[PDB]
Amino acid sequence: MDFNPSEVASQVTNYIQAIAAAGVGVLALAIGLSAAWKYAKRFLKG
Amino acid sequence: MDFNPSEVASQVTNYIQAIAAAGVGVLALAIGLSAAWKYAKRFLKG
Amino acid sequence: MDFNPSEVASQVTNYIQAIAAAGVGVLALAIGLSAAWKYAKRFLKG
Amino acid sequence: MDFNPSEVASQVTNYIQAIAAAGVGVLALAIGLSAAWKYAKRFLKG
Amino acid sequence: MDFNPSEVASQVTNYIQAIAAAGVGVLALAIGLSAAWKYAKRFLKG
Amino acid sequence: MDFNPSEVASQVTNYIQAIAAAGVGVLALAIGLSAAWKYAKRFLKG
Amino acid sequence: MDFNPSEVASQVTNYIQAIAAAGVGVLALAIGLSAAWKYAKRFLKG
Amino acid sequence: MDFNPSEVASQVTNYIQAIAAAGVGVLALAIGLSAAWKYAKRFLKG
Amino acid sequence: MDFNPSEVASQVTNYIQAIAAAGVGVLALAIGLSAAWKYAKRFLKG
Amino acid sequence: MDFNPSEVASQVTNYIQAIAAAGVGVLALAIGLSAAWKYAKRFLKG
Amino acid sequence: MDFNPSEVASQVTNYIQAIAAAGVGVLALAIGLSAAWKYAKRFLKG
Amino acid sequence: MDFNPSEVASQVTNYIQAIAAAGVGVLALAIGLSAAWKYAKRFLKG
Amino acid sequence: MDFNPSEVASQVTNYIQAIAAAGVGVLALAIGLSAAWKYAKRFLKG
Amino acid sequence: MDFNPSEVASQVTNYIQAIAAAGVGVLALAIGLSAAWKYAKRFLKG
Amino acid sequence: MDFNPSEVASQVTNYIQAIAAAGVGVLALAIGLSAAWKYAKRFLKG
Amino acid sequence: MDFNPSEVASQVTNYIQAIAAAGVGVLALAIGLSAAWKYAKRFLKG
Amino acid sequence: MDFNPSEVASQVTNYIQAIAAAGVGVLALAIGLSAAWKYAKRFLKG
Amino acid sequence: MDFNPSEVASQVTNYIQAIAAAGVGVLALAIGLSAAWKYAKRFLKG
Amino acid sequence: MDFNPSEVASQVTNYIQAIAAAGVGVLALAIGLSAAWKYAKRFLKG
Amino acid sequence: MDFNPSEVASQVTNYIQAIAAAGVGVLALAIGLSAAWKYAKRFLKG
Amino acid sequence: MDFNPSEVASQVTNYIQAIAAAGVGVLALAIGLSAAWKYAKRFLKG
Amino acid sequence: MDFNPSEVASQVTNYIQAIAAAGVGVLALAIGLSAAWKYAKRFLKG
Amino acid sequence: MDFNPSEVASQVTNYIQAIAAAGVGVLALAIGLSAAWKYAKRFLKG
Amino acid sequence: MDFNPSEVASQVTNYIQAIAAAGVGVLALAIGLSAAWKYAKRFLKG
Amino acid sequence: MDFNPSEVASQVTNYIQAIAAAGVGVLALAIGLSAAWKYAKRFLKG
Amino acid sequence: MDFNPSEVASQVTNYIQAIAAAGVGVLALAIGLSAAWKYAKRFLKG
Amino acid sequence: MDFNPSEVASQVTNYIQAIAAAGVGVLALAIGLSAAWKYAKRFLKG
Amino acid sequence: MDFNPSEVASQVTNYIQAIAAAGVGVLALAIGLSAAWKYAKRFLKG
Amino acid sequence: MDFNPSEVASQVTNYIQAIAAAGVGVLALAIGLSAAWKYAKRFLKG
Amino acid sequence: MDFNPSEVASQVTNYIQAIAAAGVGVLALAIGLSAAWKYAKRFLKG
Amino acid sequence: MDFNPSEVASQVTNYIQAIAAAGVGVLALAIGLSAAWKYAKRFLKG
Amino acid sequence: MDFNPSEVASQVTNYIQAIAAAGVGVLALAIGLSAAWKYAKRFLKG
Amino acid sequence: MDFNPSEVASQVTNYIQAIAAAGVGVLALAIGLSAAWKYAKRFLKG
Amino acid sequence: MDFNPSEVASQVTNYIQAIAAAGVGVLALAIGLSAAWKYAKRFLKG
Amino acid sequence: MDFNPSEVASQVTNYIQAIAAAGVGVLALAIGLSAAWKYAKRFLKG
């Protein structure tokens, strides 16, 4: 009732905000890791 | 008789008003809680 | 005898009329109250 | 009786209106979040 | 006795008629509400 | 004494006959009413 | 008693008939919607 | 006394016989109705 | 009771018959669609 | 009392016997239906 | 006095004997009746 | 008085003994019935 | 009852219409994104 | 009570025995089917 | 009174003991059954 | 007068003593009986 | 009168004390029983 | 129950038989298609 | 029920028709693009 | 009544606070665990 | 007569006042208790 | 006559005072007793 | 009356305190158990 | 009451202990099984 | 079911027929293009 | 309870033992099959 | 269960036997085809 | 409902815009890197 | 309640610790295995 | 739905147009580079 | 739990040990096979 | 909630740091290995 | 598992044995063929 | 979200910078090595 | 986790060490083999 179902809105949304930026810190490292042998092998052929 | 069965109306209705807002404070926390691992696992797949 | 057992009819029937409308004011609030978490949780799954 | 069961109609329906729009604010963020690594990993393969 | 137990028939039956149509106004909104995240998430996977 | 206690038999039994059929008119409507949201919600899941 | 419990049969059954066809109008749209990105992504791989 | 409590037996039992067959006409329709979206969605996944 | 639970059998089974053939009309088109770029790209390599 | 509670045993048990075989006629068709696109899509990948 | 209060014993006890067996004929039918939709719905879920 | 309230003990207890075993004959069939589609659908997924 | 279960039909169906077109705006961008390195790497080999 | 809950054991367990062997007849065919194009395409590359 | 409410304790508890072991005989078979196609399909992918 | 109203005390109290223990023999059996299907159905769900 | 209505207090209260502990012996077994298939099925999914 | 879970066996298995042969008609054409430029280019080098 | 599951058929199938032709417009350009350096390098060797 | 339904609010909400943080300690470990072979295999391809 | 039927009013009403607040102390604990496993299991799925 | 009908007042009223407090000692135990399995079963579901 | 309805408060509330902590000992084990195959299978994919 | 709700604790917890170790014996075999073709196919490519 | 999985056969196979002949038009030109400098340089050496 | 959850252990584990060895018979043939053209083409180049 | 997972073994393995010999018929022709210009050009140099 | 599912549209789409341009910065460097030895070795042959 | 939901934390987390290190022992062997033919074939080309 | 899957068409196709012309700028330089020593060495022999 | 997730470790790891050595027996033969014409043609040029 | 989803960040990221450097130790050796015959054969031609 | 991955070893290795000797029959003829004009032209110069 | 997908940009790009210059150090040596016998043999002919 | 991803490092790296030296034993023989006719023909011209 009234201005109370706003907390689901406020409490939860915010739960991910630090959390997503938190996820991505992980792919920077996840992209490069395959990216890492891409790098060793990119150098081999010539 | 007369203006007396109004108290069932007045006494009771009011019993929930603080009480509902009181319930919902609990789902804010209940929505996010599954919401919480949704959050840890949302980050894993990529 | 005669036109006297009409009061049971008149006195009593009327006792509920304000009283029923009085009851229902209570379910509006009673329907929504479960209705209330139906509402917080309706939002969670997706 | 009469024009009284209208409140279940009026009181409750309205309970979700701010509440749904309230839910969705959460998926905008929920869609993108997987959407987020979709994004880091979308970039890796080439 | 006679044509008097007809009111239980007349008085009551009618009590729901505005009332049911009144209920359903609530599911239109209840169907769509899960229906609502079905909608946000339906869009995510591809 | 004799053929007189037959009226309890005749007067009363008959009191319900219009009355039962009268009751049931009410469940047709009572069965469907839950039956009514069964109907809105039956449609949601798929 | 007699030909009266037929209304539960008549009143109710009919409640869904417009209602089911009514449900399905919703999946036509529900099937295609995932069906929709199936469609955008079906096109990507080659 | 004697052969008179047989009517409870005869009058009542029979009350359901048209009535049950009457109920079931309703599930044929009730089974299929979920059965109905089972049907729209059964078709989606592949 | 008796020959009445046959309708669940008759009413429902039939619900899919036009419906399945109806599904498949969709894969003919779904198989070929990936099948479609399989086709453009099948041609590229040589 | 005595040999009378046997009918609950006899009357009811039998109610399902045609009825179960009746259910299953429905899954033959229910298994294959997903089974149906399993079939269209099983063919696509190679 | 003497062997006379035996009739309360003899006259009455016997009043139910056909009567109980008479009652139960009614539950055979009463057990199955819920038992009846238990049966239609038992079949739906899978 | 004395050894007479033993019949409530003897007459009644015994009423269920054939009756319970009688009930259970019904669940053997009730367990398997859901058990029945559990069985058709258990087979589908792989 | 009557012309009331039409809202589930009207209220909900419409919920996706802006919403689907809304989804697809996202794949235009999702198709091209892999499409994007397809593009950088398409250029490398010769 | 006693040796009666054995039927749940006897009646049901047996329900699957023909039924499982029945399922598997379906994978022999399900394994090979992907197995089928695995087979056409296994032959292409050299 | 005294040592008599012990039978609820003795009579009932024991009712399940053969009965539980009886249930489980059913999952051995229930675990493996999905377990069964897990088994046919476990073999396919390589 | 004197030591005579003691018999109401002595004669009656004792009337139940065998009688209560006599009642309970009946619930041992009454508790388990629902307890009995609790038992068949307790086993179904998993 | 005086110290006599104490027996209702003394006689009765005590009736449950062995009796409750007696009840619970039954749930230990009642909790685990669903608990039992929870256990067989808990093991299946992975 | 009995000879009824055979239809899952009969109805479904047969669903693929025309269907597999149907798939393969597609690889004859799928094998050759790469096979097709293999063919134009096989001719170039000498 | 009846002529209603036809929309899944009509609504959806049509969703791809402009969409596939839409995909292919993309490979014309995708085939040639590798095709493009095939073209620069095809010219180098002699 | 009054300031008493506050405990549902106070007693319960707090139940999860140590508990959620408690859950998440588990995903840190749950994310990495798939994350763990992602890690062994991320290293293989080049 | 006069100001004496006020005690039913005064004596009794007051009987619950400490008593209700007394009841609720019990649900704080009753809400959370299911609330308690809601809490252990809320944490499992992700 | 005079100050003598006061004893009905004095003698009797007092009869319950130890007696009510005496009753309630019994519900403390009566509330909890259902309360007791509420407690065993409250713990099962999660 | 007075300070006596406090026992419902004192006697009962306390009934769960050892009991809840008692429940949870069970989920520690219930969380991990699915958690257990999550663990065997978490290890498989890479 | 007292030291009795401990059995739910003692009786049940222990139910899984042999049971979990029992589950895992199954994944050792479940991990390797895909693991098995991983093994045949791991060997093919070079 | 029946003569419906024929469209995957009919719809798709045909998709390539104009398409392959379409591919080859491209190698006529692709064979000659290296073929083209083969031609300029074939002439140089003598 | 006791030595009964051992069958999940005994019944199931064994289900794969003939089954795995059964899978592998298939890769011997699956390894060689690509292995087969590896073989025809291994011979071409010199 | 038992001698049933043998069909995956029997049905499938056999699927390739005519099929492999079928593949190779294609390389005889594939080896020689390059082999064909190897042949025209083998003759040129001297 | 209304203008709220627009955020999935607004929030997400934008997530990639800096992100794609971000990807490509990586291929500039990825194209040249093979491009790099292409460059050292391009120089060797003459 | 209090310091009890800590076991989910303590009992479970620890379940993987020996278990992960346990997984990885498997990739050391899984990395090298493809790694193994990488090794035989790495040696062939020169 | 409608005129929305056109963006995949519009957004993406255009992504390469500047991009291809962009690729080729690279071969002009790639053709000549071998072309470059072709040029130094073309001059040596006479 | 405890020393049980060791079997995934023990059962599986060992699955490859005979299996890898088994793979390599195949490359000895795979290395030499190209190695074989390397050998016939190594001899031709002088 | 709060500073707890940081562990996914802290626990996991770190999992690769020793692990990547660990991967690369493998390419140093992987680059040179082809690099190894590049080396034996680099020496042959002159 | 056990002595089963030996067939990959036995089935496949043997596939080439007739096959290699089969290849070489082709170079005897391939060596001499250039060898053939080497032979006509070897004779010309003097 | 926001300024976080920049790390994929920052973390990775930089991974090659020392790495490319690192590759090329290898061709200086790779160019000259053939370059090396080019050098011994360049000197022979005159 | 911790000191466990070191085995990929230890187990694998070592796999080639005997293996590379093993490769080269093959070129000593591969260099000389062309080297062999270089040798017969080196002697012819003068």
PDB file of N, CA and C in Angstrom, chain F residues 24-46:
ATOM      1  N   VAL F  24     -29.446 -24.020  -5.517  1.00  0.00           N
ATOM      2  CA  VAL F  24     -28.561 -24.358  -6.577  1.00  0.00           C
ATOM      3  C   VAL F  24     -28.391 -23.248  -7.587  1.00  0.00           C
ATOM      4  N   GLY F  25     -29.372 -22.469  -7.843  1.00  0.00           N
ATOM      5  CA  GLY F  25     -29.157 -21.383  -8.764  1.00  0.00           C
ATOM      6  C   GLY F  25     -27.967 -20.584  -8.304  1.00  0.00           C
ATOM      7  N   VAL F  26     -27.717 -20.609  -6.996  1.00  0.00           N
ATOM      8  CA  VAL F  26     -26.639 -19.872  -6.344  1.00  0.00           C
ATOM      9  C   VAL F  26     -25.201 -20.505  -6.558  1.00  0.00           C
ATOM     10  N   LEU F  27     -25.080 -21.840  -6.585  1.00  0.00           N
ATOM     11  CA  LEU F  27     -23.800 -22.492  -6.848  1.00  0.00           C
ATOM     12  C   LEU F  27     -23.416 -22.436  -8.307  1.00  0.00           C
ATOM     13  N   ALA F  28     -24.360 -22.389  -9.196  1.00  0.00           N
ATOM     14  CA  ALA F  28     -23.986 -22.328 -10.558  1.00  0.00           C
ATOM     15  C   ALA F  28     -23.066 -21.170 -10.603  1.00  0.00           C
ATOM     16  N   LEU F  29     -23.501 -20.155  -9.949  1.00  0.00           N
ATOM     17  CA  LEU F  29     -22.739 -18.964  -9.837  1.00  0.00           C
ATOM     18  C   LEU F  29     -21.570 -19.114  -8.810  1.00  0.00           C
ATOM     19  N   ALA F  30     -21.715 -19.939  -7.823  1.00  0.00           N
ATOM     20  CA  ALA F  30     -20.635 -20.118  -6.850  1.00  0.00           C
ATOM     21  C   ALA F  30     -19.453 -20.979  -7.376  1.00  0.00           C
ATOM     22  N   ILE F  31     -19.729 -21.906  -8.284  1.00  0.00           N
ATOM     23  CA  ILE F  31     -18.744 -22.846  -8.846  1.00  0.00           C
ATOM     24  C   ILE F  31     -17.834 -22.191  -9.844  1.00  0.00           C
ATOM     25  N   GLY F  32     -18.462 -21.352 -10.619  1.00  0.00           N
ATOM     26  CA  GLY F  32     -17.813 -20.658 -11.668  1.00  0.00           C
ATOM     27  C   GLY F  32     -16.957 -19.550 -11.156  1.00  0.00           C
ATOM     28  N   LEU F  33     -17.443 -18.870 -10.069  1.00  0.00           N
ATOM     29  CA  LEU F  33     -16.713 -17.727  -9.489  1.00  0.00           C
ATOM     30  C   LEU F  33     -15.266 -18.083  -9.120  1.00  0.00           C
ATOM     31  N   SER F  34     -14.976 -19.154  -8.411  1.00  0.00           N
ATOM     32  CA  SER F  34     -13.580 -19.491  -8.277  1.00  0.00           C
ATOM     33  C   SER F  34     -13.199 -19.948  -9.622  1.00  0.00           C
ATOM     34  N   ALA F  35     -14.154 -20.543 -10.223  1.00  0.00           N
ATOM     35  CA  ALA F  35     -13.980 -21.013 -11.500  1.00  0.00           C
ATOM     36  C   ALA F  35     -13.530 -19.882 -12.363  1.00  0.00           C
ATOM     37  N   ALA F  36     -13.922 -18.666 -12.011  1.00  0.00           N
ATOM     38  CA  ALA F  36     -13.599 -17.480 -12.816  1.00  0.00           C
ATOM     39  C   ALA F  36     -12.065 -17.112 -12.867  1.00  0.00           C
ATOM     40  N   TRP F  37     -11.393 -17.044 -11.736  1.00  0.00           N
ATOM     41  CA  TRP F  37      -9.981 -16.776 -11.749  1.00  0.00           C
ATOM     42  C   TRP F  37      -9.269 -18.081 -12.206  1.00  0.00           C
ATOM     43  N   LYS F  38      -9.857 -19.262 -11.952  1.00  0.00           N
ATOM     44  CA  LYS F  38      -9.249 -20.480 -12.415  1.00  0.00           C
ATOM     45  C   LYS F  38      -9.100 -20.214 -13.840  1.00  0.00           C
ATOM     46  N   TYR F  39     -10.033 -19.528 -14.364  1.00  0.00           N
ATOM     47  CA  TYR F  39     -10.030 -19.275 -15.774  1.00  0.00           C
ATOM     48  C   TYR F  39      -8.997 -18.204 -16.229  1.00  0.00           C
ATOM     49  N   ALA F  40      -8.822 -17.138 -15.485  1.00  0.00           N
ATOM     50  CA  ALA F  40      -7.873 -16.134 -15.910  1.00  0.00           C
ATOM     51  C   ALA F  40      -6.449 -16.680 -15.807  1.00  0.00           C
ATOM     52  N   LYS F  41      -6.130 -17.266 -14.638  1.00  0.00           N
ATOM     53  CA  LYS F  41      -4.844 -17.895 -14.303  1.00  0.00           C
ATOM     54  C   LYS F  41      -4.590 -19.181 -15.110  1.00  0.00           C
ATOM     55  N   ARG F  42      -5.621 -19.901 -15.549  1.00  0.00           N
ATOM     56  CA  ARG F  42      -5.401 -21.162 -16.334  1.00  0.00           C
ATOM     57  C   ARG F  42      -4.642 -20.814 -17.629  1.00  0.00           C
ATOM     58  N   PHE F  43      -4.954 -19.665 -18.100  1.00  0.00           N
ATOM     59  CA  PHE F  43      -4.397 -19.106 -19.304  1.00  0.00           C
ATOM     60  C   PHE F  43      -2.936 -18.564 -19.175  1.00  0.00           C
ATOM     61  N   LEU F  44      -2.490 -18.126 -17.989  1.00  0.00           N
ATOM     62  CA  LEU F  44      -1.128 -17.508 -17.776  1.00  0.00           C
ATOM     63  C   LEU F  44       0.163 -18.317 -18.000  1.00  0.00           C
ATOM     64  N   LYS F  45       0.208 -19.514 -17.407  1.00  0.00           N
ATOM     65  CA  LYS F  45       1.474 -20.277 -17.319  1.00  0.00           C
ATOM     66  C   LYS F  45       2.246 -20.534 -18.658  1.00  0.00           C
ATOM     67  N   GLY F  46       1.576 -21.004 -19.698  1.00  0.00           N
ATOM     68  CA  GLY F  46       2.239 -21.182 -20.963  1.00  0.00           C
ATOM     69  C   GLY F  46       2.418 -19.818 -21.592  1.00  0.00           C
TER      70      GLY F  46
END
